[PDB]
Amino acid sequence: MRIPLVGKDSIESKDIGFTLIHEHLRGFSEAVRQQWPHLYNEDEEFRNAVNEVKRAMQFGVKTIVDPTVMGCGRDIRFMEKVVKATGINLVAGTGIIIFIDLPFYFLNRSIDEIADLFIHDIKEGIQGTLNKAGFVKIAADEPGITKDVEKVIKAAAIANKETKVPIITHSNAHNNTGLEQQRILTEEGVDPGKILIGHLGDTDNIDYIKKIADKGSFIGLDRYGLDLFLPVDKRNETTLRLIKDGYSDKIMISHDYCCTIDWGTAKPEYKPKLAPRWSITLIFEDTIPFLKRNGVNEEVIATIFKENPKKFFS
Amino acid sequence: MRIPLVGKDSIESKDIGFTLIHEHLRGFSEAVRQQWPHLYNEDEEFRNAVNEVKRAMQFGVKTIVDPTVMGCGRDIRFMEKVVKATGINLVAGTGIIIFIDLPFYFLNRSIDEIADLFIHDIKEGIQGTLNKAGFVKIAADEPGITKDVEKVIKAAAIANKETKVPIITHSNAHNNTGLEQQRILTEEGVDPGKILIGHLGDTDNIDYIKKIADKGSFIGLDRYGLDLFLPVDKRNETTLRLIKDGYSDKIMISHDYCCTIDWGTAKPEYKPKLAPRWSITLIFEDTIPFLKRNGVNEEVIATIFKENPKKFFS
Ligand SMILES: [Co+2]
Ligand SMILES: [Co+2]
Ligand SMILES: [Fe+3]
Ligand SMILES: [Fe+3]
């Protein structure tokens, strides 16, 4: 019974079914929400999350993997309520999202101490519940591999070696952070096939993407719907090029959709094409249809959304 | 009725009495505590805070100012319970402690939006209660005045100009951050006498300290008890030198004691003199007695602990 699920008994990885590997039921900054609760509306967040999950299930999604962790407001009790309302298979994780330095708590603390937090969540449970973490999430972005970023990467390696759960990353597609994450993890003894290097869909530098896939890790053509990083069409072109080039067995596709996020809204940009609705089902309305009529068959779709997650969690 | 108090009616500034201007009932990283509650024990924190406050009151402390804000785990409900248990006058504040960048929430948000959070806490109340903030707290440290640090400083200026509450700072005594905070705030129209530049007691560069006091702001000879920054004796010498040099009317003394903090414990260092017990009453056991027998009279003590806080909040 490999994979722990929020609010359910654990399931064998072979039964994961059609999976969205990188979605967020909700995201927020823990410190801002604790200090200024007036900014938030949990009931609206809950309604939005339930609606999106139901829509995903209507398109045949069986399992959602939610890599919300420390820094983005992971709340296992909110997740379990969404499960109760929908019946979705939901995989929660553990980890830390930082781009520069760790919080003040971590002053004078070792990599082992950080790893112990992840292992606690995997083996004992999350936030005082018996819901266990099924993967580790880590990050790097524009600042690159800082001292503290490297500490978290190495802690994730320790957690993987002890518990065998896979690792999902956040990277910046325009620097080499994804490649660096992969290298540091594999040097620490992590199987490359247990790593998903995230946010690679943000670039059309296909050689960089192929380099990571060729080293053995899954490539996250996630953020489907955020044209800020790269338009859906260019993403689609990149996705289609990778498929016709033979990389289906390394491709993971998701939206990285946040049913509710607290980030300020950026300046809008309007293109000659009307922006597709970023949602947890955009790949069913745009990407998958775009793919199909470009010649890619059902077996490729099954590889990306079923076989690849199965392997990842196997 | 100038100064709001946690769990009490507001008091006139003239009735503040003997005040500890910079103490923490509790500190923690919001994100770490939300994600790994197993690391914390609120009942122990509560017992420790109540014990320390009671001991302070036995030495004649009437009012404690607690500059725990976003980044250090401000919790108004915990504070109100401590008030109920002790009867202390407790002044809570608003603000943000960052050293480099703001949390992800603040992407694409203006200085005005940040100021609005502080003004909400001052005028409406803290964390969904009717307990209001009586000052703004801001920080800068080893990284200096970063873009985001400057945004928070300017937001504090807006809050002060609108509400007239004073500003307490965290600075690094070994760079010019305190001087920079003072300059930026005064350029934005903040009265220098409404600013306390914190952590200046960490240095024995008296000329730097005098420079800040001479520009009109209070000088925080806080961290009494943390020999890491500077031994008590050297602090005492610095404090005594400043007094005999005429700076009593700018000096503010506190411990910056945290009844419970979640920071990892640093490598211990042992000096020929046994380390004095860092606590909220160390100045009653060491500093004030050290001062008195060095010739400083009761009027100086009243200036530092009564008249100066009165002015600050007037
Ligand atoms: Co990400
Ligand atoms: Co400080
Ligand atoms: Fe994400
Ligand atoms: Fe402090």
UniProtKB/Swiss-Prot annotation, chains A, B:
The modification N6-carboxylysine is found at K137. Binds 1 Co(2+) ion per subunit. The keyword Metal-binding applies. Its EC number is 3.1.8.1. Thermostable. One of its GO terms (molecular function) is aryldialkylphosphatase activity. PROSITE patterns: PHOSPHOTRIESTERASE_1, PHOSPHOTRIESTERASE_2. Its cofactor is Co(2+); Fe cation. Co(2+) binds at K137, H170, H199. Inactivated by EDTA and o-phenanthroline. Keywords: Cobalt, Hydrolase, Iron, Metal-binding. Optimum pH is 7.0-9.0. Gene3D superfamilies: Metal-dependent hydrolases. Fe cation binds at H22, H24, K137, D256. Belongs to the metallo-dependent hydrolases superfamily. Phosphotriesterase family. Has a low paraoxonase activity. Also active, but with a lower activity, against other organo-phosphorus insecticides such as Dursban, Coumaphos, pNP-butanoate or parathion. Homodimer. This is Aryldialkylphosphatase. The gene is php.
